[PDB]
Design a protein around this motif. Structure first.
Motif, PDB file in Angstrom:
ATOM      1  N   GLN A 113       0.826  -1.203   0.000  1.00 23.15           N
ATOM      2  CA  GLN A 113       0.000   0.000   0.000  1.00 23.15           C
ATOM      3  C   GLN A 113       0.863   1.257   0.000  1.00 23.15           C
ATOM      4  N   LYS A 114       1.905   1.283   0.836  1.00 20.58           N
ATOM      5  CA  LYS A 114       2.793   2.439   0.876  1.00 20.58           C
ATOM      6  C   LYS A 114       3.527   2.630  -0.444  1.00 20.58           C
ATOM      7  N   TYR A 115       3.867   1.534  -1.128  1.00 25.38           N
ATOM      8  CA  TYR A 115       4.553   1.649  -2.410  1.00 25.38           C
ATOM      9  C   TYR A 115       3.613   2.125  -3.512  1.00 25.38           C
ATOM     10  N   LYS A 116       2.390   1.596  -3.558  1.00 25.86           N
ATOM     11  CA  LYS A 116       1.437   1.991  -4.589  1.00 25.86           C
ATOM     12  C   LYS A 116       0.769   3.327  -4.303  1.00 25.86           C
ATOM     13  N   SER A 117       0.931   3.881  -3.102  1.00 20.96           N
ATOM     14  CA  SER A 117       0.323   5.173  -2.761  1.00 20.96           C
ATOM     15  C   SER A 117       1.214   6.321  -3.229  1.00 20.96           C
ATOM     16  N   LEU A 118       2.482   6.301  -2.827  1.00 21.89           N
ATOM     17  CA  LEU A 118       3.426   7.368  -3.158  1.00 21.89           C
ATOM     18  C   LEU A 118       3.883   7.190  -4.600  1.00 21.89           C
ATOM     19  N   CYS A 119       3.058   7.658  -5.533  1.00 20.00           N
ATOM     20  CA  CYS A 119       3.354   7.621  -6.965  1.00 20.00           C
ATOM     21  C   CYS A 119       3.151   9.027  -7.520  1.00 20.00           C
ATOM     22  N   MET A 120       4.204   9.840  -7.453  1.00 21.64           N
ATOM     23  CA  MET A 120       4.155  11.221  -7.911  1.00 21.64           C
ATOM     24  C   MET A 120       5.211  11.542  -8.960  1.00 21.64           C
ATOM     25  N   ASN A 143      -0.628   3.535 -13.112  1.00 24.71           N
ATOM     26  CA  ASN A 143      -2.074   3.379 -13.006  1.00 24.71           C
ATOM     27  C   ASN A 143      -2.450   1.916 -12.798  1.00 24.71           C
ATOM     28  N   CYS A 144      -1.793   1.011 -13.527  1.00 22.70           N
ATOM     29  CA  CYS A 144      -2.061  -0.412 -13.357  1.00 22.70           C
ATOM     30  C   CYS A 144      -1.661  -0.896 -11.970  1.00 22.70           C
ATOM     31  N   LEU A 145      -0.535  -0.407 -11.445  1.00 26.63           N
ATOM     32  CA  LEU A 145      -0.106  -0.804 -10.108  1.00 26.63           C
ATOM     33  C   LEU A 145      -1.067  -0.280  -9.048  1.00 26.63           C
ATOM     34  N   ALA A 146      -1.572   0.942  -9.236  1.00 24.71           N
ATOM     35  CA  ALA A 146      -2.549   1.485  -8.301  1.00 24.71           C
ATOM     36  C   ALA A 146      -3.875   0.737  -8.376  1.00 24.71           C
ATOM     37  N   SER A 147      -4.267   0.291  -9.572  1.00 23.82           N
ATOM     38  CA  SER A 147      -5.521  -0.442  -9.712  1.00 23.82           C
ATOM     39  C   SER A 147      -5.412  -1.857  -9.161  1.00 23.82           C
ATOM     40  N   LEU A 148      -4.250  -2.490  -9.306  1.00 20.54           N
ATOM     41  CA  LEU A 148      -4.041  -3.845  -8.813  1.00 20.54           C
ATOM     42  C   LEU A 148      -4.081  -3.863  -7.290  1.00 20.54           C
ATOM     43  N   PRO A 149      -3.520  -2.850  -6.627  1.00 18.90           N
ATOM     44  CA  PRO A 149      -3.565  -2.831  -5.155  1.00 18.90           C
ATOM     45  C   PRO A 149      -4.967  -2.675  -4.594  1.00 18.90           C
ATOM     46  N   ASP A 150      -5.899  -2.106  -5.359  1.00 13.77           N
ATOM     47  CA  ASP A 150      -7.272  -1.964  -4.887  1.00 13.77           C
ATOM     48  C   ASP A 150      -8.031  -3.281  -4.997  1.00 13.77           C
ATOM     49  N   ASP A 151      -7.850  -3.994  -6.111  1.00 13.85           N
ATOM     50  CA  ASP A 151      -8.535  -5.265  -6.312  1.00 13.85           C
ATOM     51  C   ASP A 151      -7.955  -6.392  -5.468  1.00 13.85           C
TER      52      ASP A 151
END
Lengths: 44, 58
Positions: free
Chosen positions: A35-42, B49-57
């Motif tokens: 979660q921390k890795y996929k959150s900080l994406c800037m 975007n794909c990495l952010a979407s995968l963490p939600d599912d």
């Protein structure tokens, strides 16, 4: 006796519960890290 | 003398054509580099975007 042994846990449930708690902690840590890795994406 | 004059006159035009060709080649290389940078940025955005979407599912 057959129904009791049918459970699956050969070893005592003490080490089994210890390993289960360790695995739960590891899963929680991995989920938090993901979660921390996929959150900080800037970046761009 | 005519050969010398022809060689003197063709050198300037040849240099101008070579400079125009070099400018066109540099512009083409800059356009290719800009397209590659835009493609890399779009790929990075899609990966994020794909990495952010995968963490939600999951």
């Amino acid at each position: 006796k057959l129904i009791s042994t049918m459970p699956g846990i050969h070893l005592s449930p003490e080490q089994q519960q210890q390993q289960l708690q360790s695995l739960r902690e590891q899963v929680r840590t991995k989920n938090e890290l993901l979660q921390k890795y996929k959150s900080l994406c800037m970046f761009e | 003398h005519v050969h010398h004059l022809i060689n003197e006159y063709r050198p300037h035009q040849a240099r101008e054509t070579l400079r125009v060709m070099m400018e066109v080649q540099k512009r083409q290389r800059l356009e290719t580099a800009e397209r590659f940078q835009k493609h890399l940025e779009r790929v990075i955005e899609m990966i994020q975007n794909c990495l952010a979407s995968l963490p939600d599912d999951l």
